[PDB]
Enzyme design. Structure first.
Site, PDB file in Angstrom:
ATOM      1  N   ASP A   1       0.882  -1.157   0.000  1.00 20.07           N
ATOM      2  CA  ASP A   1       0.000   0.000   0.000  1.00 20.07           C
ATOM      3  C   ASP A   1       0.925   1.213   0.000  1.00 20.07           C
ATOM      4  O   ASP A   1       2.108   1.104   0.357  1.00 20.07           O
ATOM      5  CB  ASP A   1      -0.801   0.059   1.303  1.00 20.07           C
ATOM      6  CG  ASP A   1      -2.055  -0.779   1.280  1.00 20.07           C
ATOM      7  OD1 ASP A   1      -2.228  -1.613   0.366  1.00 20.07           O
ATOM      8  OD2 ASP A   1      -2.881  -0.605   2.218  1.00 20.07           O
ATOM      9  N   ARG A   2       0.386   2.372  -0.356  1.00 20.30           N
ATOM     10  CA  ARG A   2       1.122   3.608  -0.132  1.00 20.30           C
ATOM     11  C   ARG A   2       0.703   4.244   1.197  1.00 20.30           C
ATOM     12  O   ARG A   2       1.414   4.129   2.194  1.00 20.30           O
ATOM     13  CB  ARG A   2       0.961   4.587  -1.282  1.00 20.30           C
ATOM     14  CG  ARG A   2       2.113   5.596  -1.310  1.00 20.30           C
ATOM     15  CD  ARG A   2       1.792   6.821  -2.130  1.00 20.30           C
ATOM     16  NE  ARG A   2       0.853   7.685  -1.430  1.00 20.30           N
ATOM     17  CZ  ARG A   2       0.229   8.715  -1.995  1.00 20.30           C
ATOM     18  NH1 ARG A   2       0.443   9.000  -3.279  1.00 20.30           N
ATOM     19  NH2 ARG A   2      -0.615   9.450  -1.278  1.00 20.30           N
ATOM     20  N   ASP A   3      -0.453   4.896   1.221  1.00 22.05           N
ATOM     21  CA  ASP A   3      -0.898   5.581   2.437  1.00 22.05           C
ATOM     22  C   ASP A   3      -1.150   4.606   3.577  1.00 22.05           C
ATOM     23  O   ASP A   3      -1.882   3.619   3.421  1.00 22.05           O
ATOM     24  CB  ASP A   3      -2.148   6.413   2.168  1.00 22.05           C
ATOM     25  CG  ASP A   3      -1.983   7.333   0.977  1.00 22.05           C
ATOM     26  OD1 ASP A   3      -1.613   8.513   1.163  1.00 22.05           O
ATOM     27  OD2 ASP A   3      -2.210   6.859  -0.153  1.00 22.05           O
TER      28      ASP A   3
ATOM     29  N   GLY B   1      -4.671  12.354   5.017  1.00 24.16           N
ATOM     30  CA  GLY B   1      -5.961  12.562   4.378  1.00 24.16           C
ATOM     31  C   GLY B   1      -5.810  13.037   2.946  1.00 24.16           C
ATOM     32  O   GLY B   1      -5.419  14.175   2.703  1.00 24.16           O
ATOM     33  N   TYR B   2      -6.111  12.151   1.999  1.00 18.53           N
ATOM     34  CA  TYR B   2      -6.004  12.468   0.581  1.00 18.53           C
ATOM     35  C   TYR B   2      -4.696  13.201   0.254  1.00 18.53           C
ATOM     36  O   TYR B   2      -4.688  14.265  -0.371  1.00 18.53           O
ATOM     37  CB  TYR B   2      -7.224  13.262   0.102  1.00 18.53           C
ATOM     38  CG  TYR B   2      -8.545  12.506   0.189  1.00 18.53           C
ATOM     39  CD1 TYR B   2      -8.770  11.371  -0.589  1.00 18.53           C
ATOM     40  CD2 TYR B   2      -9.570  12.939   1.021  1.00 18.53           C
ATOM     41  CE1 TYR B   2      -9.968  10.675  -0.530  1.00 18.53           C
ATOM     42  CE2 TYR B   2     -10.784  12.245   1.088  1.00 18.53           C
ATOM     43  CZ  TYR B   2     -10.974  11.119   0.311  1.00 18.53           C
ATOM     44  OH  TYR B   2     -12.166  10.414   0.359  1.00 18.53           O
TER      45      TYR B   2
ATOM     46  N   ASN C   1      -4.727   1.995  -3.927  1.00 14.30           N
ATOM     47  CA  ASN C   1      -6.039   2.579  -4.216  1.00 14.30           C
ATOM     48  C   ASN C   1      -5.930   4.085  -3.981  1.00 14.30           C
ATOM     49  O   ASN C   1      -5.493   4.518  -2.912  1.00 14.30           O
ATOM     50  CB  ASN C   1      -7.118   2.001  -3.290  1.00 14.30           C
ATOM     51  CG  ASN C   1      -7.686   0.663  -3.759  1.00 14.30           C
ATOM     52  OD1 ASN C   1      -7.287   0.093  -4.791  1.00 14.30           O
ATOM     53  ND2 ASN C   1      -8.650   0.158  -2.988  1.00 14.30           N
ATOM     54  N   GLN C   2      -6.323   4.878  -4.974  1.00 12.44           N
ATOM     55  CA  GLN C   2      -6.271   6.333  -4.879  1.00 12.44           C
ATOM     56  C   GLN C   2      -7.627   6.909  -5.282  1.00 12.44           C
ATOM     57  O   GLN C   2      -7.746   7.612  -6.292  1.00 12.44           O
ATOM     58  CB  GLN C   2      -5.161   6.906  -5.770  1.00 12.44           C
ATOM     59  CG  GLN C   2      -3.738   6.577  -5.279  1.00 12.44           C
ATOM     60  CD  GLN C   2      -3.394   7.296  -3.975  1.00 12.44           C
ATOM     61  OE1 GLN C   2      -3.748   8.460  -3.787  1.00 12.44           O
ATOM     62  NE2 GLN C   2      -2.692   6.613  -3.083  1.00 12.44           N
TER      63      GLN C   2
ATOM     64  N   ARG D   1      -9.445  -1.828  -8.477  1.00 13.11           N
ATOM     65  CA  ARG D   1      -9.701  -1.340  -7.120  1.00 13.11           C
ATOM     66  C   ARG D   1      -9.743  -2.491  -6.129  1.00 13.11           C
ATOM     67  O   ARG D   1     -10.661  -3.326  -6.169  1.00 13.11           O
ATOM     68  CB  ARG D   1     -11.003  -0.526  -7.044  1.00 13.11           C
ATOM     69  CG  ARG D   1     -11.321   0.017  -5.643  1.00 13.11           C
ATOM     70  CD  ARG D   1     -12.372   1.130  -5.697  1.00 13.11           C
ATOM     71  NE  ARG D   1     -12.881   1.448  -4.367  1.00 13.11           N
ATOM     72  CZ  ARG D   1     -12.291   2.274  -3.503  1.00 13.11           C
ATOM     73  NH1 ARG D   1     -11.154   2.893  -3.811  1.00 13.11           N
ATOM     74  NH2 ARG D   1     -12.848   2.482  -2.318  1.00 13.11           N
TER      75      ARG D   1
HETATM   76 ZN   LIG Z   1      -9.465   0.847 -10.761  1.00 15.41          ZN
END
Ligand SMILES: [Zn+2]
Length: 185
Positions: free
Chosen positions: A9-11, A19-20, A52-53, A108
């Site tokens: 994962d990143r975040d 947060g975003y 997931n972004q 996703r």
């Molecule tokens: Zn996608």
């Protein structure tokens, strides 16, 4: 020959989730993860970000801003002798406000699309690989993709019982991963 990988994962795993996050000023590497990633590379693992972004679909920031930040992250890591083998992201959400990204998709998480893509492009030995994330959806994507070891960390979203049900290991952070792996022999 196929290589083992650490999928990330990143975040919440690589960076603190403020947060975003989409700006350099708000990108904070979690303590020790760069050193850990360097050691994981030395240990023979490919490193693959699978993130997931949904902030993109939400309209919180643009795909371009994400691309710019990602280039910077890639640079920053490579400059510290951490060369990422792949960076995959999903900008989509079925309730997206930004029409271009408003859709159901295969990338996703919990869908395993990003991991399968990386597998094919980098020839990854999934059964010998690891997935590191902070939530149920990450673990679900990993099981679908036949990832051998599913790892939660405590540096992201608060861990849920369902996430734990779907995980093999729970670590304080990605910084603990190399030692946990070495201990496996
Ligand atoms: Zn996608």
């Amino acid at each position: 020959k196929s290589v083992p990988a650490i999928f990330l994962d990143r975040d919440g795993t690589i960076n603190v989730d403020h947060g975003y996050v989409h700006e350099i000023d708000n990108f904070e590497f979690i303590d020790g993860v760069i050193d850990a990633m360097r050691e994981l590379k030395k240990m023979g693992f490919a490193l693959v970000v699978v993130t997931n972004q949904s902030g993109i679909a939400r309209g919180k920031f643009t795909e371009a801003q994400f691309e710019t930040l990602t280039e910077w992250m890639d640079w920053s890591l490579a400059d510290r002798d951490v060369d990422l083998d792949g960076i995959y992201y999903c900008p989509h959400h079925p309730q997206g406000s930004v029409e271009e990204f408003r859709q159901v998709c295969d990338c996703r998480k919990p869908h395993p699309g990003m991991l399968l893509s990386a597998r094919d492009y980098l020839h990854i030995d999934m059964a010998a690989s690891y997935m590191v994330g902070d939530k149920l959806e990450d673990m679900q994507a990993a099981v679908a993709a036949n990832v051998g070891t599913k790892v939660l960390v405590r540096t992201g979203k608060p861990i849920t019982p369902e996430a734990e049900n779907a995980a093999d290991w729970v670590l304080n952070s990605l910084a603990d991963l190399p030692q946990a792996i070495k201990k496996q022999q």
